[PDB]
Amino acid sequence: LPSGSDPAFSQPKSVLDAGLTCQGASPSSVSKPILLVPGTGTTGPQSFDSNWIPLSTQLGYTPCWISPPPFMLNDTQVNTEYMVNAITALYAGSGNNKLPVLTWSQGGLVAQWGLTFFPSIRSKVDRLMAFAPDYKGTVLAGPLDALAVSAPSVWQQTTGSALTTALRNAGGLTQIVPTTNLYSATDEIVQPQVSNSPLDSSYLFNGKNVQAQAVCGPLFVIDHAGSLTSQFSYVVGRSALRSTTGQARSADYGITDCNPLPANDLTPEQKVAAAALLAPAAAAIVAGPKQNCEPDLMPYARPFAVGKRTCSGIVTP
Amino acid sequence: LPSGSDPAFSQPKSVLDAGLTCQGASPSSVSKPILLVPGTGTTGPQSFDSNWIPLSTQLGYTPCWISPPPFMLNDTQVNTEYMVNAITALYAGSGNNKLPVLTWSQGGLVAQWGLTFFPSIRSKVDRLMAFAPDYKGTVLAGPLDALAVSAPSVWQQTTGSALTTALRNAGGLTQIVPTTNLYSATDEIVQPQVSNSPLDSSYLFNGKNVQAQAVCGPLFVIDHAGSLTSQFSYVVGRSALRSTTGQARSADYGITDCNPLPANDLTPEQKVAAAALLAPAAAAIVAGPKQNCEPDLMPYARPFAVGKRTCSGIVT
Numbered sequence: 001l002p003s004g005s006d007p008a009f010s011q012p013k014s015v016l017d018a019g020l021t022c023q024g025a026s027p028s029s030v031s032k033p034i035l036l037v038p039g040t041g042t043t044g045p046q047s048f049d050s051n052w053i054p055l056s057t058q059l060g061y062t063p064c065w066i067s068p069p070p071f072m073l074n075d076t077q078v079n080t081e082y083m084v085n086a087i088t089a090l091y092a093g094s095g096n097n098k099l100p101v102l103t104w105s106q107g108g109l110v111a112q113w114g115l116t117f118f119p120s121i122r123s124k125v126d127r128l129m130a131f132a133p134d135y136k137g138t139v140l141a142g143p144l145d146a147l148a149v150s151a152p153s154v155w156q157q158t159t160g161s162a163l164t165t166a167l168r169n170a171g172g173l174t175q176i177v178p179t180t181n182l183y184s185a186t187d188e189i190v191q192p193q194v195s196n197s198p199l200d201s202s203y204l205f206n207g208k209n210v211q212a213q214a215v216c217g218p219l220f221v222i223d224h225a226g227s228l229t230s231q232f233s234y235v236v237g238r239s240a241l242r243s244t245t246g247q248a249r250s251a252d253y254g255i256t257d258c259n260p261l262p263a264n265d266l267t268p269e270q271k272v273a274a275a276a277l278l279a280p281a282a283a284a285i286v287a288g289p290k291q292n293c294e295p296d297l298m299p300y301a302r303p304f305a306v307g308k309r310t311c312s313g314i315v316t317p
Numbered sequence: 318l319p320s321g322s323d324p325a326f327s328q329p330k331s332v333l334d335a336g337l338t339c340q341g342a343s344p345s346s347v348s349k350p351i352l353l354v355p356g357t358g359t360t361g362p363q364s365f366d367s368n369w370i371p372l373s374t375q376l377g378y379t380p381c382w383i384s385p386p387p388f389m390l391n392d393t394q395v396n397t398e399y400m401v402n403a404i405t406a407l408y409a410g411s412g413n414n415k416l417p418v419l420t421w422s423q424g425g426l427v428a429q430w431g432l433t434f435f436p437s438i439r440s441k442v443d444r445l446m447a448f449a450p451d452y453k454g455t456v457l458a459g460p461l462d463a464l465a466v467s468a469p470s471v472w473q474q475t476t477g478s479a480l481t482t483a484l485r486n487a488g489g490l491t492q493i494v495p496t497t498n499l500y501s502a503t504d505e506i507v508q509p510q511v512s513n514s515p516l517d518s519s520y521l522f523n524g525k526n527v528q529a530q531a532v533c534g535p536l537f538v539i540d541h542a543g544s545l546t547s548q549f550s551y552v553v554g555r556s557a558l559r560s561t562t563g564q565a566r567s568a569d570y571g572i573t574d575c576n577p578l579p580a581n582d583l584t585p586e587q588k589v590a591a592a593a594l595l596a597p598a599a600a601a602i603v604a605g606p607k608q609n610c611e612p613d614l615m616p617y618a619r620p621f622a623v624g625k626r627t628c629s630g631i632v633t
C-alpha cells in the first residue's frame with residue numbers, strides 16, 4: 001500500500017473546484033458533508049438526485065458531489081483528482097471532521113483508487129459505502145473495447161486492464177478505511193459478481209461485503225441501478241452510515257428489507273426518476289468519447305502494472 | 318436461386334454420418350429433432366452444451382448437432398455437406414417431417430449456403446433460427462490472426478470473399494425458409510451489424526431480423542456469444558420455435574425481456590459455461606490450420622463469383 005507523498009494533480013485546483021458542489025452550501029463551510037461519487041456516463045445530480053441526495057439529507061448530512069467532465073467517461077485517474085480535491089476541501093470546510101464517501105458504479109473504483117494512491121485522504125475519509133463498485137472492473141466491457149466504441153474510463157474499467165491491475169498490485173483490493181460494498185449477483189453491467197466471495201468485482205478483503213443474494217436468497221434479483229436506489233440499498237447504506245464500526249451490521253437488515261424497488265422514503269416522482277436511472281447514462285455513453293486503446297497510467301501507478309499495454313505501449317519497469 | 322439436383326458430396330457418406338449426434342436418439346428414430354449448427358472453432362457440444370442443447374430439450378425437442386472437423390475451421394462448403402446430410406437423415410427418422418434448424422455464427426452461413434445450393438433440403442427444413450449469422454461475412458480482421466494467415470473458413474467469412482460473393486449472387490441473401498435472425502450492434506466478431514437494416518451481416522430479405530438494440534436500446538450489450546446465450550436471445554428463440562409462421566413474433570418479446578446475462582433457465586454452472594463460450598473458440602482459431610488464400614469454390618458455386626480470387630487464382 002503506497003504511503004509517501006500524494007501524486008501531483010494534472011488539473012489546476014480551480015478546475016477541480018469547478019466540479020464540486022454541495023446542496024445549500026459552499027464546501028469551504030458545510031455542516032456534516034457526505035461526498036457522493038457518480039457512476040459512468042453521469043454527473044453527480046444524474047446519479048443521485050432521485051436517491052441519495054434527498055435520502056442523505058433526511059439522514060442529516062449535507063450532500064456534496066463531484067461531476068468530472070464529460071460524465072465520468074474520461075480517465076478514471078483524473079476523475080479521482082476531483083474526489084481527492086473534494087475530500088480535502090470538505091474535511092477543512094467542515095471543522096476538520098472526517099466525512100463519509102458514498103458511491104455508485106465507477107465512483108467506488110475512483111474512491112478506492114484515491115485511498116490507494118493519495119495517502120493524505122486516509123485520515124479524512126470516515127467510511128466508504130460503495131454500491132455496485134467495480135474494483136476488478138467488468139468482463140462485459142470487453143466487446144466494447146474490441147469495437148473501439150469504449151470511452152477512456154470504460155477501457156480502464158475492463159477486467160484485465162492496466163488500471164485494475166495497478167489497483168490490485170498496489171494492495172487496493174484490501175479495504176483502506178471501513179468499507180461496505182453492496183452488490184448483486186444479477187448485476188447486468190458489472191460481472192463477475194456471482195460467487196459471494198473474493199472473486200467478485202465488488203469484494204474487498206476485510207470489508208463488509210454484502211451480496212444482495214446472501215441476505216435475500218440466491219433467487220433474489222436486483223440489477224445495477226437498483227443496487228443504488230432500492231429500499232434494501234437504503235437500509236444497508238443507513239446501516240453503514242450510522243454504525244460506530246464504520247461498516248454495515250448484519251443485525252441491521254434482513255428478509256423484510258429485501259425490496260429491490262426504489263426506497264420507500266422517496267417521493268413518487270423521485271421513484272419514477274430512480275427506476276429510470278440508467279437512461280441518461282445510455283445517451284451519454286453513445287454520444288461520448290470513444291477510442292481503440294486504454295489510457296496510459298499516470299507515473300505513480302506504472303510500477304504496479306508492468307507488462308500491461310496502454311495507448312503508448314507496454315508499461316515498463 | 319439454384320434449382321436442380323444436389324451437388325455431389327466431396328466426403329464419404331459414412332464420414333458425414335459420424336459427424337451427426339442426437340441426444341438420446343438414433344437419427345433413424347427421433348421425435349421432434351432440432352439440428353444445431355455450431356460456430357467457428359467449436360464442436361456442436363462446445364457451442365451448445367451450455368445453452369441451446371438444454372434449452373431446446375426443455376422446449377420438448379431432441380437436440381441434434383454436427384461437428385465438422387477440425388472445429389468448423391475447414392472449408393465452409395464441406396461444413397455444409399455435414400448439415401445437408403444431417404437434415405436428410407433427421408427428416409426421414411422423424412417420419413418425413415420438416416425440422417427446425419438453429420445456428421450460431423458460421424452455423425447460419427452454412428445453413429443458408431445449404432439452402433441456397435442443395436435444393437433437396439428446402440422441403441425438409443421447417444424454419445431457421447440463426448443467432449449472430451454472418452451471411453455477408455465480417456469486415457473485422459480481428460486480433461487473432463496476422464492478416465491473411467487464417468483457417469479455410471475464416472478466409473471464407475471475410476467480407477469480400479469469393480464464398481460470400483457467391484452466396485449473394487446466387488440469391489441466398491433472401492430467406493429461403495421461414496427464418497429468424499437474432500443479432501447485436503455490439504457484436505465484436507461480426508460487423509457491420511449496427512444499422513438495424515439490410516446493411517447488417519445478419520439480415521435476410523423477407524426474414525424476421527431482430528437486432529437486439531432496436532428493442533432493448535443502444536446500451537443493451539450482448540457480444541457475439543451473448544447473441545446466442547442471453548435471456549433476450551432465449552425469449553426470441555422460443556418465440557421462433559413456437560410461432561405458427563416459423564418466424565419469431567414481435568408480440569412475444571419486448572423491453573422487459575432485455576437481460577444480457579445468460580438465459581434464466583440455465584443452471585448456475587451452465588450460466589458460467591455460457592458466459593465463457595468465446596475464449597476456447599477463439600483459441601482453436603488461433604491454434605488451427607492456416608493458409609495464405611481462400612479455398613476454391615466448388616464447381617456449383619463458381620458461376621456466382623466470377624472475378625474473385627481464390628487459391629488456384631481468379632474464378633473464370
Ligand SMILES: *[C@@H]1O[C@H](CO)[C@@H](O[C@@H]2O[C@H](CO)[C@@H](O)[C@H](O)[C@H]2NC(C)=O)[C@H](O)[C@H]1NC(C)=O
Binds near residue numbers: 010011069070295
Ligand atoms: C481527460 O484525461 C486526460 C488524460 O488523463 C487529460 O489529459 C491530460 O491533461 C493534463 C492537464 O491538461 C496534461 O498536463 C496532460 O499532459 C494530459 N495528458 C494527456 C495524455 O492528454 C485531460 O485533461 C482530461 N480532460 C478532462 C476534461 O478532464
Ligand SMILES: *[C@@H]1O[C@H](CO)[C@@H](O[C@@H]2O[C@H](CO)[C@@H](O)[C@H](O)[C@H]2NC(C)=O)[C@H](O)[C@H]1NC(C)=O
Binds near residue numbers: 328392612
Ligand atoms: C477440408 O476441406 C478440403 C477442401 O474442401 C477437403 O479436401 C478435398 O477432399 C476431397 C475428398 O477427399 C478431394 O476430392 C479434394 O481433392 C480435396 N481438396 C483439397 C483442396 O484438398 C478436405 O477433405 C477437408 N478436410 C476435412 C478433414 O474435412
Ligand SMILES: [Xe]
Binds near residue numbers: 040041281
Ligand atoms: Xe453504464
Ligand SMILES: [Xe]
Binds near residue numbers: 112
Ligand atoms: Xe474515499
Ligand SMILES: [Xe]
Binds near residue numbers: 154285
Ligand atoms: Xe458502458
Ligand SMILES: [Xe]
Binds near residue numbers: 278281536
Ligand atoms: Xe447503462
Ligand SMILES: [Xe]
Binds near residue numbers: 418428429431432442
Ligand atoms: Xe438449413
Ligand SMILES: [Xe]
Binds near residue numbers: 477478479
Ligand atoms: Xe477476401
